[PDB]
Structure formats: structure tokens, C-alpha cells
Amino acid sequence: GTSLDLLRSLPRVSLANLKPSPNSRKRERRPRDRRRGRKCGRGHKGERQRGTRPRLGFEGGQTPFYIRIPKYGFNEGHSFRHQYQPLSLRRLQYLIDLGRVDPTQPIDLTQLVNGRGVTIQPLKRDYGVQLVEEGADTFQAKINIEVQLASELAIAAIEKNGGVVTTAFYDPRSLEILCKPIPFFLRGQPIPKRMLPPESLVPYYTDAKNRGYLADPAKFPEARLELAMKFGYVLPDITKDELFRMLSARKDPRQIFFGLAPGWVVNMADKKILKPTDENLLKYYSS
Amino acid sequence: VLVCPPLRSRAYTPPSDLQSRLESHIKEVLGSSLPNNWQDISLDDGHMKFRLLAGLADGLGHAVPNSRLHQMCRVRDVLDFYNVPVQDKSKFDELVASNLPPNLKISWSY
């Protein structure tokens, strides 16, 4: 270009000609001149000038401000609280629009992370992704999304457009493998079973209205219809829809990945899957 | 026994008959007898550009610099590029031959 044309005329670029970007660096002030020498910015003789003033929060000897306020349990149990990285429907639709999520295939935490739709940190107590009601109106997509937590209104958007929404619990060990599958296969260890939710979460994931994976299949129809009446839409017939098998697809409660059973081993180098023939191990894994 | 040819000069003066050479070269390259609006013809075709520019370089003795190769979109650009002269005389050489006043004397130590 025109700017590129100027470079042609100018002398050859070399190691001598190198220059830092304007104002990128600062002058480092040293103590050798009158303004910055002598007392060297430390004032007169005293404790702060000897370099030995007290610690932070020390207010001269009176009871400090931070120690004189009652202890309260704002942050108690913080390290064991459950975190769900929320997902809104604007982000979901936006991701589907740009081809970073495949709506035709079933959706799960692995395919959200693969398309960089969501960022998950298992080490920071993340237990999955919670769907959020923001963006329901703009949502006009039919997709089978699995998310650990769901909401009433978020369910309506998925169902109204003719989609399947399910909620499943992944324990801390299961979640790490789900977000990051490949390395687990590199470790060489067999795939583990997925533990059931602890007592606190048992009511939620067994509840029909929450679309829990362990919930009774028979009660789903009624729960969907009641929600359909509430939000003023007519239930679509998924069975008639051509992709009924895909939408209806649901992984086993003890499965981390749809198509892989617990106890198998994946050999990427040889492009093979190894399954144990031992009866004892099969008993344990089948459980 | 590869013998290096004598070094060539890097100064080029446009020939007066440059137009005759260019029009003849275009006719030879494509054999269309110089269709009207010949200058407007683009050099998008890779083979076309190579045959034209390379042929002119052999005869004229100057070749388009790689930096200026991309901007030779049309024949007119190629024609303009050859027209401008190229001088190897350093700015000092101009001073030496500038016929400076007698009180000014210059001696070259290099």
C-alpha cells in the first residue's frame, strides 16, 4: 500500500535501527541527583524513614478497624459451595448461528466447551452449566441440550420451539473428564462410573418438573403440558418430528459420554477401544 | 567452468523508441495485433505477466522489482514503470559534476 511504499524508499531495516514504540518505556529514577538524592524521598529522621514502620492495619495502638468488627459468616463454607457457570439463550442462539454448535447432534458439556461456548473450571468448584432465561424471546431453535441446572422459563423456550431439555448431575471427578476428555484417554486409565447425586440434590434430579434424568419417565408428559398452558403455547409432537431418535437420545445415568460404557479403555495411537472380559470387573462397572 | 559474467550497471535510461518496443512486445506475446485500448489490458493471468515482463527485461535490461511487481495491474502501469529513469550516480557524483564555484573544492577519500 501507500504506507508500504514508503518503506521501500527508506534504508534497510537492521538491528541498529530498532526503536521502541513511542512512550512504551519510562525513565527509571535513581537516587544520584539532588531532587531524588540526599534524603531520597523518605522525609526527615523517623520510623518511616528508618524503613521500619509498623504493619498494615496497625492504627498506632488503638484497636484496629479490621479486628474490632464482629466476625460473621459471610464467607463460611465458600470453598464447598457449588458453582454453575451460567449459560444464557442469547449466547446459545449466537453460538448456533455462527456454526460453533451443531444443533442436529445432541448437546452436552463436552460440545459446549469444544465450541468455546462456555469456560469451565472444575478446580474452582464448577459443577456444570445452568441455563438462564435471558434471551428466551429471540430463541427459535430446536436442540437437545443437557445442562446440570435448568429454569422454568428457560425450559419453555426450548420446549416451545420443539426441543428437549434435560438436567443431569456430574460429580467433580466426572465433570473434569467431561470438560477435558482427550487427556483422560491419554492417561491410560479406564473410564470411571458416574456417582449419583448426594442427598441434598436427590430431590431436584428426581423431580419431573425440573426434567431430572433420574425422574420418572411417565410423569414428563403431564409436567410439560402444565408448563405449556402456563406460557401460552401448544406442545409440539416430537415423535412425529423426523429426528425423534436424536432428540430423545439420553445417556445412561452411569455414563459420562453417550457412546462409551464405564470401564472401557481408548487407545488413540492404535485407534481401538478395549473392553474388559473379566466377569468381576464387569460386575463392578455395570453397577 | 562457470565464469561469472561481468557485473551489470544498475542505471537505466528510458529509450526514445520504448513505445515501439512495448507495442511490438505485446503483439508478439498474444498475437492480437495490438487491440485498441492495449494499455488498459490487465496482467491478471500469471503466464501473461511472466512472458511480458520477462521479455521486456531481457531487451531493455531492467526488470520489475518484486516489491513493485504486484502493482503492475495493467499494461499502463508496466509502461510507466519503464519510462521513469534509474540513476546509479550517487548524490556526491552530482556535486562533483555540478561545476561548483572555484572557491569550493571537494576531494574524495573513499
Binding site: Y94, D97, L98, I182, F185 | -
Partner: protein
């Protein structure tokens, strides 16, 4: 008897788990703009001297920025061509709304244009019409 049995039929389920290292090219849609709001660059390309390229995520490179906690600015980043023409066009576009010529900076080396205040929504649509 071997302790393991190997089956290659099910290995396809692991190819599904492999993630991509590239941002997929957006899929063609019948009707634009998409429900989210995304609209692809217009065809044919604009004939203006300056071209504003899209980000690797296929979005218009207009960002709200802030410094010192109260200096609100909006910056165009992937500008190409003659940036000065873009400044003049933006100055005319934003002057009637504010009632004054906006204060702007042109970073020729970085190829960016900076505008005081937040005008992300207005500029995004304005750039959309031109087809950049």
C-alpha cells in the same frame, strides 16, 4: 483367555469428542439477519477507500473501552486503507446526534480510530449498512 476384548466399531464416538483448533466458517442462512442478530458482510464489497475487516469470530471490531474509571470511549480496530476517510465519515455521522464534532484519535500505525463516549450500537449499524 485374554483379559480384554478390542472393538473398533465404537471408536467413532471418540472422534466426536475431539475439539477443533479453528473457528468454523459461519453456515449459510436462508434469511438474514439471524435470530441472534448476526449479519454476514454484504456482497459485493463496499467501494469506499477504506475497508474494515471483521474479527476472527465474524463480528464487527467495535469495542467499548474505558480508562481511569470515567473516560468512556469506543474504538474501531481492524481498519484498512485510508483511515482518514473513515474519520471524516464518522465525524459527520455522529455530529448531528451530539450537536458537536466528536473528539477522535487516529492511530495510523495500529490502524484504529478512537472516539470519546460510547457509540457502539450506532456505529455497528452504521458500519453494517456500508457492508464492511
Amino acid at each position: 483367555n485374554p483379559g480384554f476384548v478390542e472393538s473398533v466399531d465404537e471408536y467413532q464416538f471418540v472422534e466426536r469428542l475431539l475439539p477443533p483448533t479453528k473457528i468454523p466458517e459461519p453456515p449459510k442462512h436462508k434469511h438474514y439477519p439471524t435470530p441472534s442478530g448476526w449479519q454476514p458482510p454484504r456482497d459485493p464489497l463496499p467501494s469506499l477507500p477504506y475497508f474494515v475487516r471483521r474479527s476472527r469470530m465474524h463480528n464487527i471490531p467495535v469495542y467499548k473501552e474505558i480508562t481511569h474509571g470515567n473516560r468512556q470511549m469506543t474504538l474501531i480496530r481492524k481498519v484498512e486503507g485510508d483511515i482518514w476517510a473513515l474519520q471524516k465519515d464518522v465525524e459527520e455521522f455522529l455530529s448531528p446526534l451530539l450537536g458537536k464534532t466528536p473528539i477522535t484519535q487516529v492511530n495510523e500505525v495500529t490502524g484504529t480510530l478512537r472516539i470519546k463516549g460510547y457509540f457502539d450500537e450506532q456505529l455497528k449499524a452504521w458500519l453494517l449498512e456500508k457492508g464492511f
